[PDB]
Design a protein around this ligand. Structure first.
Ligand code: XYP
Ligand code: XYP
Ligand code: XYP
Ligand code: XYP
Ligand code: CL
Ligand code: CL
Ligand code: CL
Ligand code: CL
Ligand code: CL
Ligand code: CL
Ligand code: CL
Ligand code: CL
Ligand code: CL
Ligand code: CL
Ligand code: CL
Ligand code: CL
Ligand code: CL
Ligand code: CL
Ligand code: CL
Ligand code: CL
Ligand code: CL
Lengths: 311, 315, 314, 315, 312, 314
């Protein structure tokens, strides 16, 4: 119930070496030269310049994404946008450009092997169909390790741009994107604000027992194929290093979140769990009649919130 | 839902192989040969009597470590052998129970696990975005395509098995269903080690039609790919890549006796895609058609399978 | 699921228009002209920069008050303009976010809301029973049919927009998908105000085939109607009424450049019904065919849409 | 099972949501209705039945709407007892003439009123603004413009018309219906003293605030679709305010006639709790038939009850 | 197929040389059993109609049940034997029976062995798919519908023998399975004067199994999946041929009224047209474009009108 | 979708057995004894090496001829033996491949086919109407109920196997899943011939709860029955009949070591119905709980099964 959801705050599952793991990971990332590249890209828009932007990241993977900038003298405020799980079509260029038309230098980072970008990370062994369980038996090999770092590197690259006001950079996204937005804000102090639509990758131990649809269930499919009890124990150990309930505590930027009460993909409880772990200026928008989908009303909130803090 | 039986019997789509088809594989096999197998065996406890069970790994294309269980009849050989390939994302606990049962039928059996699926390592980089699944990983290039490494692993597997002392290299067979049947055929086409081939409704065949006739996963992964990459050239390049791995192009190299099965109401590996591969085989072959079965275990064909293998390898 | 492409490219069903087709509309436009627009603008706050947003209403057929958001680029014009029509029962919050984004692309945009759906008033009486939905309201007579008022509202909308000072009347376009695309085409056919037309898989086309080929709502609303009214004459009269609103009969009056899209696996607006309308257009036209898309947002066509509108209006 | 426990259902009695002007609203509505001349009309209608006369009956009602319906009377000297039958939501085919005629064959002068724009009848009421696909939310932002305002009055006027017939014993008139029909039967009995008995199969339009959170199928969910399209918080508040004027938990209190109701425990359309809520608000001779293994459908066993109950009170 | 093709679809009969002999013998075995009918008053909230429970002995000495409703007045009244759909009988469909009586017909709703009611003594030879469709399917002598068909015949014999029943005005009606029993009964007996069958089932079996999209025809497919032996399939269809309507229709000489919904997935239009096109008698088929395997209001008027004309 | 694991571990519904429970079976076993087994063996060709395969029939309750494949390790015995029972309407080609594989594991195995399902004759008359399926055949009386004959066939099967020379009567086991597991437990309860019992998510247990918790067939066959027979007494009598065959009433007679499995997301044999049976066992027992599996083949439990049988028989 809404009354219980408002109070649901599961106990962190972070291991003693939680922060050490990330400290090291950030370091390995730092050992890679960004070597960013910009390439003009033609698009039927007036008042905005569009480019294709790539840069080197963790494991020497080349990360892609479209970069749209308001066509005028800046520095303009900027946004790094993250897309949903297996939900990126044509690098979501139309969204990127529209954000630019709203006055934001925007870059839509494409998640490794999904919407685009290269993934050099080896596949240690078998796993369920999907990205959720690639290299899940070790925090070092897990899929989202590289992804999280790419999100951080993305901010480093954007911030370094001359036409970008480094003091007015925001991160936004829904589900997977919202999770990347929060993880990036937790692992970096570059973003000034965070907006996350029903964030994914949160409260994994409950998610696998409450979700009714993919992709959380990819973990269940994994356990079905690997009956060893130790596998389950090790898998959840790995996931704890990437769980939002453990990362939320490091977020110090103002955060705006949304949750649809009939969401079957990113269950309300998993989202409230992340929200209730945030120790910063925050606000959660609850929509009774919406699920894992585009919520018109929240779009107004999003625009208003970003405008207030960046525009 | 697919073609009638009269048309199916005559369906033989034009090969889509490019001029460099055989060259591509010739090079691929070479790169594979540049990797030392360095196989390893490790005893594995299992509640069976009369059979020895092991965990077997070996190095393959791109230096990937391939896994799989290896069961051998507990007695003096050399015993005939079988390399078994599992279905797409359909491997549970490395299918050990099946492996062991095959051994109990008198065969030295190895169930190779497909890269990143049932097990095994996949070192191959992911060039760029692709649809959820393995079907489109590195699909924009025959060199980077997922099944390139897999096919080679299948070949290397045979090289490893054959080299075993307790294995009669003249009585080695390859079996599998769907993805497994496709790997069985591809291995026989790329190697002369196997003496016989059994493939239950083979997958990875007649791609250009499959994407227009399949009603369920995983062929539709290709469709999802094109939805996310509207560029017309992408489609053209993707099918170019697939042609190098299509069974209608590999079948022609199979010279071993082949037994195949097809369920007429199969929605995953459409009858037409399977007949297409079959009609491209130029060797002793036989296709078992089951009117009331789909993409599933077909009891009646199991008898055929056993009988066929027994005749050519066992008795 | 539909008929081969090679056949689709040649599918051109025989018009079903009755002798009084054009007369019916001539009279309808007249009745509409007997109503004073009396438009109204009201500022509306929206978290956007560089665009002014308003709520716009005006009187139309049967004295119905029509609603819609109106967004204009915040700067000296006259700016080119677009009248956007939304899909069947597919309007949320008057689709304000789309309206505003169009304005941000440099177009004075008005998203007309279809009577009783996304908004707007519908004074038209309900003659008798009909299936759940709008598709069969007053279907037993062309005078009482639901889309009669809607079509006229679309026309009146253009009259209102065109009269605006910050709007260049020579650069006005109509766009929409499914129901919206049908309204865009119908408006261009009944008026000469719009310069260009863009229609994503248009609805309300080739009714007699649609009811035998569609796999999902809302075309099937007609089938539900016939199930509840077994009288043979009802079916005959219903299709007679529909003929006056069918795109295969209106397309012939469209003289503006038209851009259309169709997803080959569309179950709602079957490919054949869309090709039928397209093949009846006698004007500069182009149909974008997408093999792997259905009745949904097609990213690739969005580029075409922007490009086409930019070329003809910007 | 999916709703509240049977033990809890028997005690579920939600607090009325009626506003201070509840009874005033209806008092005025009945008055506006009275300002319209019925001007009924009868027209012979041919039907393959023996022993029954069938007619088409229309009459003027609220907003000057012409209401339709078939009228069947036992072919013999009366006055006969009479029934006004109301049909389910968008569930009327050919004006349900076969049911009408069968009721007449049971000895009842029967009239099946057709709900505005659904099974038949005219609806003059204007559509104030946008609303969800369906009738549930037409003019929902005001009790004066709400769809069921005209419908309820039509049901009342129907009774006035029937009662005035010479071949009808005004002291033996009943109202029956299921779901929407049962709701109209109860509403009519609450707003009129003409009917002697009421039978309602799992009544609809009851306990709206809970219904929208418990229903698993249409048409209650039309309200949810409405709120999805109109995010304004005030809209929700105003919509429920409007619904309260038509909610059975607020009208039941005015029912003084003997009432028979049925509820299927696995009903997903008219959830058991919404039905028990209406029943528990009735202050009159009543009886609720509970069927564990039935849902929103025809319940054979309750048909016997229905016939037996009507026969006892009217026959 | 298209309505144009459906109108001409007339599959070749599958009847074996001993077709008529099989039934001739079956009718004889039936005749060796004493009906010994029984009537028992049954209370029902109806006025103007008397209701009873009627049982009688049939093939294999099975006791057949059913409700019997008669107009409460001096007859003899015309009569109807109603057959219910496959596994579609609730409370012996008493409400329908009673309503028919209220329409002026002495009506008996025979309940099909083990389904809506009635006893089934026939042994189960061996394994078969879940359902009745394949019980004893490996032999025409042991097949489930053999006993059912005969019960339908015996039912007419019993009804006809009633004093309050005009034996020259007896009809048989039913939908799907019921319609199949109505036709089969008219083909195996000359007692009924008219036949009404809503989208008849048990027709054109060899095509039905390849065209049906839902149960219960698919029960045959389930059977073949569980019994891979090729001979099993051959023998099964051999058995079915003895009960197929395309082989029985030719013996129907009574006026017949049929209905078919073009979107029917249970009793595919082609299987129904196949039966219809094999009828050599006064007949008429009502085609409904927008209806499937369900109650069709418009056809109900036709049904009433047709029965009224020929019996009323 | 059931209760918590904490509650399941403690769920032990009150037995529903009637005073004449044990008397009913005592008589039933007697009637069975009045029938001469008259078993028959017939060689059957199968592409296997090291195993002999036969078709075995024998007479049982009501003089029904029961079938099944019989595979024996091709070597000098006596070998340990297994009687395998198949799932509800889940037998294809008499599951010969499984039978033969068991034999290859060293067990003389007989896969009894359940009356009218996988094979075997069912002479029992059908008293009256019932729902589509076997679950409610003759449900209005314990004497006429379908599973009465089936249970006895299971017992007679053990009598026949035990009597074989190549079979060590002190090492005979019964195994099965769902319906098969229910037959394995019932047989062990009605006979002292089997030394061990293995039952995968046993069916036919805790009927009164099952009908309110099951989400799929075949338990729901009972619900279909009550829908077609509204008489309140019917329901009462039906559950009375079922009580005589419910595992929660038979489990108490099982004295052999028992191994059971349950998938927590099982919708066919709900976890609670299986735990109810398990918690009524008063013998060496162990229940394997699988969180991510349902009514299906569970690889991990197969290892347990093999290991358990090997320990007690091989
Ligand atoms: O899913 C919904 C979509 O269908 C609609 O178009 O916009 C709002 C979304 O929530
Ligand atoms: O119970 C009835 C059944 O016997 C009949 O066949 O179909 C209608 C049902 O209501
Ligand atoms: O199937 C239809 C049913 O849903 C409706 O209620 O009554 C008419 C039938 O044809
Ligand atoms: O249902 C699963 C099946 O699909 C797989 O093949 O084997 C393991 C089972 O649990
Ligand atoms: Cl891993
Ligand atoms: Cl959702
Ligand atoms: Cl909401
Ligand atoms: Cl690629
Ligand atoms: Cl399939
Ligand atoms: Cl088959
Ligand atoms: Cl109308
Ligand atoms: Cl679609
Ligand atoms: Cl496409
Ligand atoms: Cl309103
Ligand atoms: Cl329901
Ligand atoms: Cl019930
Ligand atoms: Cl048989
Ligand atoms: Cl149907
Ligand atoms: Cl029709
Ligand atoms: Cl399950
Ligand atoms: Cl598990």
């Amino acid at each position: 119930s809404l009354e219980e959801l408002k109070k649901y705050k599961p106990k962190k599952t972070a291991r003693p070496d939680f922060s050490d793991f990330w400290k090291k990971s950030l370091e390995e990332l730092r050992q890679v030269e960004a070597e960013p590249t910009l390439e003009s890209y033609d698009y039927p828009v007036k008042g905005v310049k569009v480019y294709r932007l790539t840069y080197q990241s963790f494991g020497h993977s080349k990360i892609e994404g479209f970069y749209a900038v308001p066509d005028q003298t800046g520095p303009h405020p900027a946004l790094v946008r993250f897309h949903g799980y297996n939900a990126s079509y044509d690098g979501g260029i139309h969204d990127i450009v529209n954000w630019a038309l709203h006055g934001y230098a925007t870059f839509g980072m494409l998640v490794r092997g999904q919407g685009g970008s290269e993934d050099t990370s080896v596949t240690p062994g078998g796993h369920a169909l999907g990205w959720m369980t690639k290299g899940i038996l070790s925090k070092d090999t897990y899929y989202y390790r590289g992804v999280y770092l790419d999100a951080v590197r993305a901010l480093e690259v954007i911030q370094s741009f001359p036409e970008v006001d480094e003091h007015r950079i925001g991160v936004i996204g829904g589900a997977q994107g919202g999770a990347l937005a929060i993880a990036a804000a937790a692992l970096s102090d570059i973003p000034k604000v965070v907006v996350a639509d029903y964030p994914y990758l949160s409260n994994f131990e409950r998610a696998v027992d409450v979700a009714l649809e993919q992709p959380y269930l990819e973990i269940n499919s994994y356990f079905r194929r690997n009956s060893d009890p130790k596998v389950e124990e090790k898998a959840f150990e790995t996931l704890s290093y990437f769980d939002l309930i453990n990362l939320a505590g490091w977020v110090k930027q103002p955060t705006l979140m949304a949750i649809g009460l009939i969401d079957k993909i990113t269950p309300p409880s998993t989202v409230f769990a992340a929200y209730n772990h945030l120790e910063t200026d925050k606000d959660l928008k609850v929509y009774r009649y919406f699920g894992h989908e585009f919520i018109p009303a929240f779009q107004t909130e999003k625009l208003s919130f970003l405008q207030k803090h960046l525009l």
